[PDB]
Amino acid sequence: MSIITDVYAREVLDSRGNPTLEVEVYTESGAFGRGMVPSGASTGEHEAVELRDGDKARYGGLGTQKAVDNVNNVIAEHIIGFDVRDQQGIDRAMIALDGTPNKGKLGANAILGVSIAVARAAADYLEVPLYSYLGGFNTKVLPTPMMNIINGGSHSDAPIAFQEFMIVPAGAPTFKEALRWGAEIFHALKKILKERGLETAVGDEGGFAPRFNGTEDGVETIIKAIEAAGYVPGKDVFIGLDCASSEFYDAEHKVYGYTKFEGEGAAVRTAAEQIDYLEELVNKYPIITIEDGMDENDWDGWKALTERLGGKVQLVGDDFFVTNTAYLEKGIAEHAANSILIKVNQIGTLTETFDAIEMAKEAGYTAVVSHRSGETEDSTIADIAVATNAGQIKTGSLSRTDRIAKYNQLLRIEDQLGEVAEYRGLKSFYNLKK
Amino acid sequence: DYRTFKLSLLTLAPIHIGNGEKYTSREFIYENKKFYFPDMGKFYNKMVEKRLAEKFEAFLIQTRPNARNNRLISFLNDNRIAERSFGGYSISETGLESDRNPNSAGAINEVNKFIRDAFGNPYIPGSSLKGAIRTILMNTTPKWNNENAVNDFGRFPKENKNLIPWGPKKGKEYDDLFNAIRVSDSKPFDNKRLILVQKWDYSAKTNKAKPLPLYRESISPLTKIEFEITTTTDEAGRLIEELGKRAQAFYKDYKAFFLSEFPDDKIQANLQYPIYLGAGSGAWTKTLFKQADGILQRRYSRMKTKMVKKGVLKLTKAPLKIVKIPSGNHSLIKNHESFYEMGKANFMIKEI
Amino acid sequence: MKNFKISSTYRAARKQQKTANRKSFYNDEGYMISPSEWADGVIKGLINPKNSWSNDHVKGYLPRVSPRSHWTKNGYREYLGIGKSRDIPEKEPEVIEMMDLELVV
Numbered sequence: 001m002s003i004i005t006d007v008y009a010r011e012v013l014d015s016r017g018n019p020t021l022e023v024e025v026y027t028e029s030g031a032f033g034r035g036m037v038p039s040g041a042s043t044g045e046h047e048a049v050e051l052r053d054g055d056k057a058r059y060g061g062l063g064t065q066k067a068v069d070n071v072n073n074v075i076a077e078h079i080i081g082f083d084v085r086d087q088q089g090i091d092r093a094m095i096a097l098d099g100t101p102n103k104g105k106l107g108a109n110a111i112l113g114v115s116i117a118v119a120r121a122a123a124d125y126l127e128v129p130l131y132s133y134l135g136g137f138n139t140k141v142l143p144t145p146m147m148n149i150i151n152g153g154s155h156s157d158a159p160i161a162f163q164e165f166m167i168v169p170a171g172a173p174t175f176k177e178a179l180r181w182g183a184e185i186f187h188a189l190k191k192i193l194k195e196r197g198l199e200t201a202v203g204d205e206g207g208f209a210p211r212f213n214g215t216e217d218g219v220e221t222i223i224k225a226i227e228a229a230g231y232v233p234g235k236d237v238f239i240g241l242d243c244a245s246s247e248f249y250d251a252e253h254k255v256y257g258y259t260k261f262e263g264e265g266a267a268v269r270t271a272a273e274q275i276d277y278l279e280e281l282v283n284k285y286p287i288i289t290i291e292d293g294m295d296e297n298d299w300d301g302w303k304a305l306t307e308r309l310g311g312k313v314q315l316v317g318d319d320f321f322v323t324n325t326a327y328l329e330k331g332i333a334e335h336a337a338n339s340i341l342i343k344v345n346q347i348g349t350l351t352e353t354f355d356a357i358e359m360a361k362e363a364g365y366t367a368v369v370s371h372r373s374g375e376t377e378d379s380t381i382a383d384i385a386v387a388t389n390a391g392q393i394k395t396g397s398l399s400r401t402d403r404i405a406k407y408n409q410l411l412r413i414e415d416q417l418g419e420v421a422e423y424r425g426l427k428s429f430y431n432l433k434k
Numbered sequence: 435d436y437r438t439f440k441l442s443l444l445t446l447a448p449i450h451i452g453n454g455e456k457y458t459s460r461e462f463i464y465e466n467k468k469f470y471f472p473d474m475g476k477f478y479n480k481m482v483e484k485r486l487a488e489k490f491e492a493f494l495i496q497t498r499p500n501a502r503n504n505r506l507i508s509f510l511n512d513n514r515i516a517e518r519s520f521g522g523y524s525i526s527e528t529g530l531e532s533d534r535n536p537n538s539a540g541a542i543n544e545v546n547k548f549i550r551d552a553f554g555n556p557y558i559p560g561s562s563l564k565g566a567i568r569t570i571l572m573n574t575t576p577k578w579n580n581e582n583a584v585n586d587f588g589r590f591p592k593e594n595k596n597l598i599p600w601g602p603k604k605g606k607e608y609d610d611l612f613n614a615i616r617v618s619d620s621k622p623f624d625n626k627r628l629i630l631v632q633k634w635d636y637s638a639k640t641n642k643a644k645p646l647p648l649y650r651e652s653i654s655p656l657t658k659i660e661f662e663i664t665t666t667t668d669e670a671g672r673l674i675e676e677l678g679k680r681a682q683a684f685y686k687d688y689k690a691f692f693l694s695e696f697p698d699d700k701i702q703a704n705l706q707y708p709i710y711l712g713a714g715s716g717a718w719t720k721t722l723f724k725q726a727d728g729i730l731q732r733r734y735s736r737m738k739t740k741m742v743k744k745g746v747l748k749l750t751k752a753p754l755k756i757v758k759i760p761s762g763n764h765s766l767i768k769n770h771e772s773f774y775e776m777g778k779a780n781f782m783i784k785e786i
Numbered sequence: 787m788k789n790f791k792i793s794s795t796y797r798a799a800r801k802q803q804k805t806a807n808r809k810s811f812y813n814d815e816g817y818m819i820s821p822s823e824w825a826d827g828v829i830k831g832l833i834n835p836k837n838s839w840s841n842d843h844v845k846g847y848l849p850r851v852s853p854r855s856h857w858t859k860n861g862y863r864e865y866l867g868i869g870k871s872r873d874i875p876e877k878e879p880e881v882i883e884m885m886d887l888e889l890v891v
Contacts, residue, residue, distance in 0.1 A: 004846075005799045028798040080799070080846020444887075529876075640850055656882050678890065706890050738816030742843065756881045759889060763881065782888055 001029035002084045002125050009071035009113060011064050014039045014374035015402040016204060021064045022376075023071055023113035025121040027084045033121025037109040039374030040345040044102065047322050048348040051107025067110040074106065075114055084122045091115055091349040108348040115349045116380050130380065131413060134350070135387025140420050142175035142410060143369070143385040143393035144168060144428045146240050146289060147182040148207045149189060149225075150218050153261055154247055156209035158218075161261040164207070164242035165218055166394070167226065168288055170425035171236035175414045178423065179398075179407055181231060186398040189225035204373050206397030206404075214262065219285050233286045240289030241281075245274070246319050249295040256295075271301040275308050282313050288429065291316035291341065302336040310338045311433050316368055323347045325356055332363040338431040339366040341394065344381060357388045366431045368392040375402035379409035386413050391428030437671045440786045441563070441661040443709070446702055446766055447774035448631045448652030448750050450548060451562050451712040457545040460494060463507050463518075464536050467527040469630060472520030480520060486513055501540065523554075523625040525651070530751035530772055531630040533645040546713075548628060548651040555622035556653075558711075563661055564617035565720075566711050571673055572598075572722060573687065574680045579722050584729070591729050614670035618662045629654050629752060633714065634773070636747040638695050643749055643773065650714065655755050655766055655774065663783075677783045678707035692718050696747050699769040705759065706780035715777025716748050750776040789867040793852040796844065805842035812838045 006026040014020040022036040042049050051070065053063035078097055082090050094114060098106040123133040131139045147167045152160025167185055172178035189208065194200055198210035212218045223233045231237050248260040256274050258266035269277055271294070278293055290309070294301040296319040306315060316339040321327045323346035331337055340360045344353045357367040369385040371394065385393045393410070396403035414421045463470045481490045493509045502508050509515075532541050548556045572578045578597055585594045599609045633648035653659075665671045673680075685708040693701050710719035717723075717730055727744070734741040752774045757764045767774055800806065811824035814833055827833035853865045 003795050003848075005795065005848075006803050007846075026802055028795050077845050077847065081795075081848050639847055641847075642851070656884070682890075704890070705887065736818035738812045738818075738838075738840070740840070754879045756879045757884050757887075758881060759884060759887055761889070765879075782890075 001027065002031070002122075003028045004080050004082045004084050004090075004118070004121070007071065007076040007079050007114060007117070009068045009110065011068050012036065012376075014376050015400065016374040018062050018374055019059050019064045020374065020376065021068050021071070021109055021113055022378075023110075023117040025084070025114070025117040027121055027125055029125060031084065031121050031125035033084075033117040033119065033124055034378075035113045035116025035118075035120060035380070036376040036378035037113045037116075038345050038372035038376060038378075040109070040343070040372055044322070046102065046324055046327070047346055048103045048108035050109035050345070051104075064109065067107040070106045070110045071114060075110060079114060079118070084118060084125055087115070087119055087122065088351050090118050091351040095349065103348050108345060111348050112345050115351075116378070119350055120380070129413070129416060130383040131386040133387075134354075134383060135389065139387050139389065140417060140422045141386065141389040141391050141428070142414050142417075142421055142423045143382075143391055144170055144423070144425055145175075145178060145182065145407070145410075146368070146392065146394045147186070148205045148242075148394075148397045149186060149222065150212075151203055151205060151207045151209050152212070152215075152218065153244065155203055156211075158209065158211045159262045159266075160212060160215050160218060161243070161245075161248055161258045161266070162215055162241050163244040163247070164205075164291075165222060166240035166242065166289065167222065168238040168240050169231075169236060170238055170288070170428070171232075172423065172425060175410055175421070175423045178425075179411065181229070181237065183398050184229040185225050185231070185237065188228040189221065192221060192225055192228065202397065202399045205371075206399030206402075215281075219281075223285070238286050238288035240291065241287060241293075242291040242318070243278075244292040244318065246292060246295045249298070251295070251297070254298075271298060271304065274301070275305055278305065279308060282309060287313060289314045289316060289339075291339075292318045292320065294320070296320050296322075299334060299336060302331075303334055306336055306338060310431075314339050314366065314429055314431060316341050316366075318370070323353070323356055325352070325359060328356060328359055328365075332359075332365070338364065339368060341370045342367050342384075342390075343370045343372060344384065345372060350384075353384065354388065357390060361388075364431055366390075366392055366429065368394050370394045371396050371403070371406070375405075377401070377405055379406040382406045382409040382413065386410070391424055391430070435666065437665040437674070438786055439663040439665070439674055439677075439783050441663055441677070441781050441783045443558075443563075443659045443661065443711075443779055443781045444706060445653050445655055445657045445659075445779045446705070447655055447776055447778040448629060448650070448714075448752050449558075449712045449777060449779060450546065450631075450650040450652040450714055451558060452546050452650070453549045455547045457547060459504050459543050460499075460506050460509075462545070463510065464505075464527075464542075465507060469525040469527065470518065470522065471524070472518075472522040476521040480517065484515070486515075489513060504540075504543070507537075525625070525628050525630055528629055528631075528753055530632075530753065532632055532649065542630070542649050543647070544649065545630065546648070546650040548653075551622060553622070556625065556628065556651075557622040558620040558659055558661075560617040560619040560661070562711060563619075564612075564615070566709055567615070567617065567677065568612065569720060569722075570677070570681050570684045570709065573724075574683045579724055581725065583722055583725055590733070611667070611670060611673075614665055614667040615674060616664040616666070618664070620659050620661060623653075623657065623659065627654050627657050628652065631750040631752055631774075631776070633776070634749045634751060636696060636700055636749050636773075637742075638746075639742065643771075652750070652752075655752060656757065674783070675785065677781075681707040681709055681781070684708075688718065688723070691723055692716075692744055693747075695744065699767075700747060700749060700773055700775070702767055702775045702778055703764075704780055705757075705764070706782045709779050709781050710777045711779050712777050714748050714750065715775075717745060719777065748776045749773040789854060790851045791854045793849050796848050796850045799844050799846065799848055800841065803842075803844055805844055808842040810840045810842070812840075814838075 005028050009021050009023045012022045020037050020039050025033045040050050042052050051067040053066050054061045094111045123130045148164050149167050150165040152158050153163035169178040169181040193210050203209050226233045226237045248257050250257045256269045315337045317337040318341040321340045360367045367390045369381045395406040534541050536542050550556050583594050583597050585592045631652045633646040634643045636643045665674050731741045751772050755766050811819050813819050828835045855863050856866050858864050
């Protein structure tokens with residue numbers, strides 16, 4: 001009655017209008033699970049690549065019929081007959097059936113869809129919440145959200161080198177209050193931008209990309225919106241940055257070129273100059289998180305940044321670690337960063353996602369479950385964040401349903417947990433001293 | 435300029451080579467724990483001297499026997515014949531000749547005959563062994579086992595017979611390789627080496643063996659048969675001196691392709707260089723299975739007996755036999771349900 | 787077929803993979819034919835309606851069949867074929883002497 005009876009994938013659309021796939025798993029008793037895959041990247045040296053058709057006539061080469069056929073004709077024949085609760089056995093079986101480290105033969109999207117659908121069907125069969133099935137009985141911590149609010153960099157035409165700016169309502173008593181604070185600050189910032197003549201329309205995260213004068217102007221408007229909503233910066237709501245300095249890092253001269261986004265009047269900063277710039281930004285503003293402060297290959301820079309700022313600010317490696325167990329182990333060994341961005345489709349299966357989260361936890365690092373640019377109505381990453389008691393989530397802004405779905409799932413999880421639910425806020429930054 | 439090789443064939447399983455003819459149930463008698471196949475002419479000659487020629491003719495003419503008038507033993511019992519000296523031969527009853535009772539139901543209605551000469555003695559033709567050797571050689575030569583072996587210029591794909599050059603060419607030196615390889619047939623063996631195996635098919639999806647109404651006259655396991663192979667060129671001499679270690683490579687590819695999907699106890703072990711001979715060994719033993727994959731199954735996609743995935747395993751039933759070798763006691767098959775991999779044999783080739 | 791029955795897992799698989807909704811039909815020579823010509827042949831008598839169709843294919847290598855049970859004389863349950871499986875060890879085997887045989891490593 002828990003035997004997997006049918007596995008079926010079909011092609012759907014993600015939040016950007018591009019195709020992705022979705023897998024349904026039926027067991028013998030009738031338990032049903034549905035896993036939908038966010039749109040990741042099909043290229044990468046040591047990242048799980050996803051299968052796309054490449055047919056330029058259909059969807060501009062972004063069709064997922066090949067991965068759908070891989071699930072329907074290859075994975076289904078191998079998975080049907082398994083116990084639905086054998087998550088690790090199913091995932092190892094799919095990894096062996098693929099036989100490629102980057103999962104290029106079957107496709108990481110196919111394997112992830114099957115893994116999520118199997119986990120959801122197993123939770124349905126046991127009639128337990130998904131976080132209870134994934135993390136056991138001791139699942140109580142609601143993650144502290146890093147709400148993307150203003151995005152610049154390659155997502156804006158403004159002279160801002162940094163990719164994203166986030167608000168972290170770590171001073172709230174509950175997750176419901178933190179969500180309310182983020183929504184109110186979002187609307188206050190929308191009003192501030194409307195009275196300033198700047199554009200209001202949201203991007204692919206739900207955040208605004210207005211034509212600010214610079215990074216400092218953007219941060220100053222963030223604090224202005226926080227205070228307009230009626231909250232104390234540095235005590236209730238903090239500021240996070242997603243620099244992603246890999247995009248404007250020039251590897252030939254080993255320098256961080258700010259002229260790519262901030263114009264010719266910007267300052268070209270070396271590794272040490274970048275450290276000093278990040279340090280003075282942290283000193284000036286209530287910045288609690290800096291993500292991808294250095295290039296993915298600048299290991300010595302990353303180490304120097306961790307010595308300089310790792311005691312007071314959270315340094316998250318997004319492209320530095322690429323959700324890789326080997327790269328995370330190397331970073332732990334070299335004392336590079338103190339946090340890792342966990343993107344579930346970057347690795348391929350739930351078992352490896354979990355394994356990376358536990359490896360990061362055992363080293364004193366923080367695991368931040370992250371969205372993708374193209375998301376879906378599937379909100380499994382919220383259940384992953386609660387199941388692991390990760391304490392942090394980066395699931396986007398407060399506007400679009402590809403973010404609001406995960407926020408609503410966390411609201412439902414908090415309501416279900418009731419008096420046991422814990423929102424730790426600043427205590428979720430256990431990688432930081434005191 | 436001629437090289438002569440001796441190929442010793444040791445059957446590890448029943449081997450059937452047919453002639454297109456089949457014994458009907460009105461032609462053999464199941465009695466005294468044996469199948470007696472009389473000579474029809476001698477039987478008729480003895481039946482005209484007993485004034486039963488018209489009765490026997492009415493017995494044989496009848497095109498629709500009900501259930502029991504289809505057997506010769508019914509005629510021999512009703513008409514009170516006790517004589518059994520009609521020439522012919524006999525096959526010792528094995529027990530694993532039909533999954534049902536041969537004397538109760540319809541059971542063995544037809545038996546596929548083994549190939550015989552004009553004297554009625556069974557033998558293995560040299561064309562059959564040459565075809566098996568040619569399959570082994572073609573599957574292990576990368577210049578013949580490629581996509582150029584498929585003739586796609588047609589309604590449906592077929593083999594490229596011109597891939598290995600044969601025949602005379604106008605103004606060109608003679609370039610027939612397989613004219614240099616000359617496989618002779620066997621000296622005839624005795625009918626005491628013949629059994630009455632039945633076709634069983636083992637499916638990887640159903641995970642069980644299903645019997646089929648296909649009974650064959652087969653050589654018993656552990657039969658020694660000698661062949662002489664003559665080579666007239668140098669390249670064919672290298673090919674035939676490499677018949678082993680090419681049979682091993684072919685069997686390694688065949689096991690990695692087909693036999694790995696079935697339980698290990700259903701797959702036999704090799705004492706010498708493996709080979710598959712005669713009917714019943716399967717489609718992949720007779721094709722370039724690397725290039726015939728896909729095409730072969732789609733050839734049967736619109737038939738009722740549809741080829742699903744890579745097909746089923748052919749496993750006949752024949753008595754278990756232990757052999758004494760230097761390693762000790764060797765069981766021919768690893769299962770206790772008495773399942774031989776039909777058509778399997780081993781060989782050793784020497785340079786006499 | 788009395789010793790075994792259809793397994794419930796295979797029945798569920800066939801039920802909600804909808805393999806019976808995609809039947810293939812055949813004539814008396816076992817060749818695939820459209821449902822219209824199959825109906826026409828069955829009505830005309832040229833096709834046996836019983837053994838001339840297939841229920842697609844179920845994926846996943848599930849066991850199609852499970853052992854069937856019955857009641858013993860004391861009211862306990864028992865597999866149908868477990869106890870009448872065999873009575874004699876079939877005698878056998880035969881140890882053929884083949885010491886003169888060059889084996890291959």
